[PDB]
Design a protein around this ligand. Structure first.
Ligand SMILES: COc1ccc(-n2cc(C(=O)O)c(=O)n(Cc3cccc(C(F)(F)F)c3C)c2=O)cc1
Ligand SMILES: *[C@@H]1O[C@H](CO)[C@@H](O[C@@H]2O[C@H](CO)[C@@H](O)[C@H](O)[C@H]2NC(C)=O)[C@H](O)[C@H]1NC(C)=O
Ligand SMILES: *[C@@H]1O[C@H](CO)[C@@H](O)[C@H](O)[C@H]1NC(C)=O
Ligand SMILES: [Zn+2]
Ligand SMILES: [Zn+2]
Length: 215
């Protein structure tokens, strides 16, 4: 998160920190959010050979009683996900067991808010602590320069006149508008110039229910 502020610890208790394993590289990291006690929603580009979810985190370098490190048994990447266009950048992770509900862990033109442990700058490292930024929902033409952006599939997020933005490592986290999840951090420019592209959750809600009901 570029241009945001540190959250009050555990103020966003649905937030999931994902450590993703690949066979041919070191670990990578994403966000996500707990939608059921045993399901986390994130972006498809966060898929890997294996994933661990950490719930209840604030300072992700300092283990604490709020932490629940949970095994992911199966990854449900959208079957039409496209690794070029990044259409359909949405994935469900089924957790091995249902999480514990605690104070720190629970399920989940206008201004919206996005939170994550991503980089605080193009050349800056990932944040130790959960950061949040408020971003403006843009008219789709503000994202035209992303040639494979589609207004029906995706939100266009963040005023190009501000430097505020999600960035690397914030992938898969929720954009909330008036307290409801509406987007998932998907992609943007390498220079972090807004706006960025978020998956439009509403479009995927039939697919989400299908997965939940079958698992
Ligand atoms: C399908 O078309 C695309 C076009 C762009 C990329 N691409 C490319 C980058 C690069 O080239 O380094 C890059 O850093 N990022 C990260 C990035 C940048 C800006 C904002 C964000 C976000 F807001 F999403 F968090 C993110 C994740 C990136 O998404 C991925 C596919
Ligand atoms: C997050 O927690 C870590 C503890 O692991 C903090 O890291 C310490 O930070 C100070 C600088 O403020 C260093 O001098 C210490 O060496 C660090 N300790 C360790 C174990 O690495 C970090 O400051 C915390 N971040 C917050 C709360 O913003
Ligand atoms: C992904 O999108 C590209 C460009 O529109 C298309 O040519 C390609 O076949 C797609 N890949 C799959 C199999 O989804
Ligand atoms: Zn916050
Ligand atoms: Zn704590």
């Amino acid at each position: 998160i570029i241009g945001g502020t540190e959250c009050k610890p555990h103020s966003r208790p649905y937030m999931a920190y994902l450590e993703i394993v690949t066979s041919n590289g070191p670990s990578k990291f994403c966000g996500g959010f707990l939608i059921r006690r045993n399901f986390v929603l994130t972006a498809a580009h966060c898929a890997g050979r294996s994933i661990t979810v950490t719930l209840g985190a604030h300072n992700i370098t300092e283990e604490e009683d709020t932490w629940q490190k949970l095994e992911v048994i199966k990854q449900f990447r959208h079957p039409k996900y496209n690794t070029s266009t990044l259409h359909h950048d949405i994935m469900l992770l089924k957790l091995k067991e249902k999480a514990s509900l605690t104070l720190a862990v629970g399920t989940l033109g206008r201004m919206c808010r996005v939170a994550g442990w991503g980089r605080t700058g193009v050349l800056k490292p990932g944040s130790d602590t959960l950061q949040e930024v408020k971003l403006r929902l843009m008219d789709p033409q503000a994202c035209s320069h992303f040639r494979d952006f589609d207004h029906n599939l995706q939100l266009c997020v963040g005023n190009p006149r501000k430097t505020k933005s999600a960035f690397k490592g914030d992938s898969g986290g929720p954009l909330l508008c008036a307290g409801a999840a509406q987007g998932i951090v998907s992609y943007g420019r390498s220079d972090a110039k807004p706006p960025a592209v978020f998956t439009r959750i509403s479009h995927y809600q039939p697919w989400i229910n299908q997965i939940l009901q079958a698992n």
